Design an enzyme around this catalytic site. Structure first.
Site, PDB file in Angstrom:
ATOM      1  CD  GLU A  35      15.355 -21.710  -2.025  1.00 11.05           C
ATOM      2  OE1 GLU A  35      15.617 -22.931  -1.996  1.00 11.05           O
ATOM      3  OE2 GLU A  35      16.236 -20.819  -2.015  1.00 11.05           O
ATOM      4  CG  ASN A  46      21.947 -28.822   1.948  1.00  7.69           C
ATOM      5  OD1 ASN A  46      21.407 -28.454   2.999  1.00  7.69           O
ATOM      6  ND2 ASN A  46      21.511 -28.459   0.765  1.00  7.69           N
ATOM      7  CG  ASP A  48      26.171 -29.468   5.093  1.00  9.78           C
ATOM      8  OD1 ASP A  48      25.134 -30.077   4.788  1.00  9.78           O
ATOM      9  OD2 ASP A  48      26.156 -28.306   5.542  1.00  9.78           O
ATOM     10  CB  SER A  50      22.390 -29.901   6.579  1.00  9.92           C
ATOM     11  OG  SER A  50      22.849 -29.210   5.435  1.00  9.92           O
ATOM     12  CG  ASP A  52      18.192 -27.099   2.133  1.00  6.39           C
ATOM     13  OD1 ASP A  52      18.822 -26.893   3.176  1.00  6.39           O
ATOM     14  OD2 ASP A  52      18.698 -26.950   1.008  1.00  6.39           O
ATOM     15  CG  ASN A  59      20.734 -26.065   5.788  1.00  6.45           C
ATOM     16  OD1 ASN A  59      20.713 -27.209   6.236  1.00  6.45           O
ATOM     17  ND2 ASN A  59      21.782 -25.577   5.131  1.00  6.45           N
TER      18      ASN A  59
HETATM   19  C1  LIG Z   1      16.835 -20.715   4.281  1.00  9.28           C
HETATM   20  C2  LIG Z   1      18.116 -21.298   4.885  1.00  9.28           C
HETATM   21  O1  LIG Z   1      18.068 -22.151   5.739  1.00  9.28           O
HETATM   22  N1  LIG Z   1      19.395 -20.775   4.370  1.00  9.28           N
HETATM   23  C3  LIG Z   1      20.704 -21.289   4.871  1.00  9.28           C
HETATM   24  C4  LIG Z   1      21.508 -20.147   5.389  1.00  9.28           C
HETATM   25  O2  LIG Z   1      20.908 -19.658   6.615  1.00  9.28           O
HETATM   26  C5  LIG Z   1      22.945 -20.512   5.638  1.00  9.28           C
HETATM   27  O3  LIG Z   1      23.726 -19.272   5.786  1.00  9.28           O
HETATM   28  C6  LIG Z   1      24.330 -19.169   7.041  1.00  9.28           C
HETATM   29  O4  LIG Z   1      23.278 -18.837   8.053  1.00  9.28           O
HETATM   30  C7  LIG Z   1      23.858 -18.489   9.366  1.00  9.28           C
HETATM   31  C8  LIG Z   1      22.748 -18.127  10.304  1.00  9.28           C
HETATM   32  O5  LIG Z   1      21.955 -17.093   9.720  1.00  9.28           O
HETATM   33  C9  LIG Z   1      24.814 -17.314   9.217  1.00  9.28           C
HETATM   34  O6  LIG Z   1      25.360 -16.923  10.517  1.00  9.28           O
HETATM   35  C10 LIG Z   1      25.027 -15.634  10.821  1.00  9.28           C
HETATM   36  O7  LIG Z   1      25.776 -14.684   9.914  1.00  9.28           O
HETATM   37  C11 LIG Z   1      25.495 -13.272  10.255  1.00  9.28           C
HETATM   38  C12 LIG Z   1      26.307 -12.353   9.388  1.00  9.28           C
HETATM   39  O8  LIG Z   1      27.644 -12.801   9.301  1.00  9.28           O
HETATM   40  C13 LIG Z   1      25.791 -12.974  11.730  1.00  9.28           C
HETATM   41  O9  LIG Z   1      25.335 -11.659  12.027  1.00  9.28           O
HETATM   42  C14 LIG Z   1      25.094 -13.938  12.662  1.00  9.28           C
HETATM   43  O10 LIG Z   1      25.561 -13.715  14.017  1.00  9.28           O
HETATM   44  C15 LIG Z   1      25.327 -15.359  12.301  1.00  9.28           C
HETATM   45  N2  LIG Z   1      24.453 -16.220  13.174  1.00  9.28           N
HETATM   46  C16 LIG Z   1      25.028 -17.431  13.836  1.00  9.28           C
HETATM   47  C17 LIG Z   1      24.156 -18.308  14.723  1.00  9.28           C
HETATM   48  O11 LIG Z   1      26.159 -17.707  13.665  1.00  9.28           O
HETATM   49  C18 LIG Z   1      25.930 -17.685   8.299  1.00  9.28           C
HETATM   50  O12 LIG Z   1      26.810 -16.536   8.118  1.00  9.28           O
HETATM   51  C19 LIG Z   1      25.403 -18.100   6.962  1.00  9.28           C
HETATM   52  N3  LIG Z   1      26.535 -18.613   6.149  1.00  9.28           N
HETATM   53  C20 LIG Z   1      26.655 -18.203   4.733  1.00  9.28           C
HETATM   54  C21 LIG Z   1      27.813 -18.734   3.902  1.00  9.28           C
HETATM   55  O13 LIG Z   1      25.855 -17.470   4.256  1.00  9.28           O
HETATM   56  C22 LIG Z   1      23.554 -21.299   4.473  1.00  9.28           C
HETATM   57  C23 LIG Z   1      24.923 -21.790   4.842  1.00  9.28           C
HETATM   58  O14 LIG Z   1      24.811 -22.794   5.848  1.00  9.28           O
HETATM   59  O15 LIG Z   1      22.731 -22.456   4.095  1.00  9.28           O
HETATM   60  C24 LIG Z   1      21.374 -21.980   3.690  1.00  9.28           C
HETATM   61  O16 LIG Z   1      20.642 -23.057   3.257  1.00  9.28           O
END
Ligand SMILES: CC(=O)N[C@@H]1[C@@H](O)[C@H](O[C@@H]2O[C@H](CO)[C@@H](O[C@@H]3O[C@H](CO)[C@@H](O)[C@H](O)[C@H]3NC(C)=O)[C@H](O)[C@H]2NC(C)=O)[C@@H](CO)O[C@H]1O
Ligand SMILES: [Cl-]
Ligand SMILES: [Cl-]
Ligand code: NA
Length: 129
Positions: A35, A46, A48, A50, A52, A59
């Site tokens: 990373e 990114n 969008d 945002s 990291d 993120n």
């Molecule tokens: C290290 C880092 O920052 N990685 C980023 C990822 O966190 C991010 O993935 C998205 O993160 C959110 C929050 O964890 C995910 O939402 C959660 O999803 C789970 C399972 O579906 C659910 O149980 C939770 O309730 C939900 N939390 C909230 C607040 O909604 C989301 O699904 C992730 N999206 C994907 C495609 O994986 C990604 C994408 O923004 O970016 C990384 O950099």
């Protein structure tokens, strides 16, 4: 700060990451290498809008506030700049919340593509832990 491999392993272990949610220490060291190349000051933007931040490239869309990611969440309740310090406490504490959020370490794209399913124990070989 740019950490050494074993220096970082020892710091992460002291902060409770070894086997946190079932992920052995080698997983966390491998993720940090790919990373950020072990550099606490790493930033990347990114598509969008945002950004990291830090050794684990956390993120700003979800986890920290940088004042320029409109309509984002601050789920770790910290300024993103706190994640760039030479002290990894803030990064580690936020990472604990991320990995507990449902998807485990798949939240880290480089872990999924470069660490998952490899022999991650090799990343802590030789270290005094
Ligand atoms: C290290 C880092 O920052 N990685 C980023 C990822 O966190 C991010 O993935 C998205 O993160 C959110 C929050 O964890 C995910 O939402 C959660 O999803 C789970 C399972 O579906 C659910 O149980 C939770 O309730 C939900 N939390 C909230 C607040 O909604 C989301 O699904 C992730 N999206 C994907 C495609 O994986 C990604 C994408 O923004 O970016 C990384 O950099
Ligand atoms: Cl390991
Ligand atoms: Cl898991
Ligand atoms: Na944010």
């Amino acid at each position: 700060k740019v950490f050494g491999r074993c220096e970082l392993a020892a710091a992460m272990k002291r902060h409770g990451l070894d086997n946190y949610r079932g992920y052995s220490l080698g997983n966390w060291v491998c993720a940090a290498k790919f990373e950020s190349n072990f550099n606490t000051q790493a930033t990347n933007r990114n598509t969008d809008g945002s950004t990291d931040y830090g050794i684990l490239q956390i993120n700003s869309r979800w986890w920290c506030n940088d004042g320029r990611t409109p309509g984002s969440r601050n789920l770790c309740n910290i300024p993103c700049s706190a994640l760039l310090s030479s002290d990894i406490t803030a990064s580690v504490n936020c990472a604990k919340k991320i990995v507990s959020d449902g998807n485990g370490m798949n939240a880290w794209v480089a872990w999924r593509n470069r660490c998952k399913g490899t022999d991650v124990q090799a990343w802590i070989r030789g270290c005094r832990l």
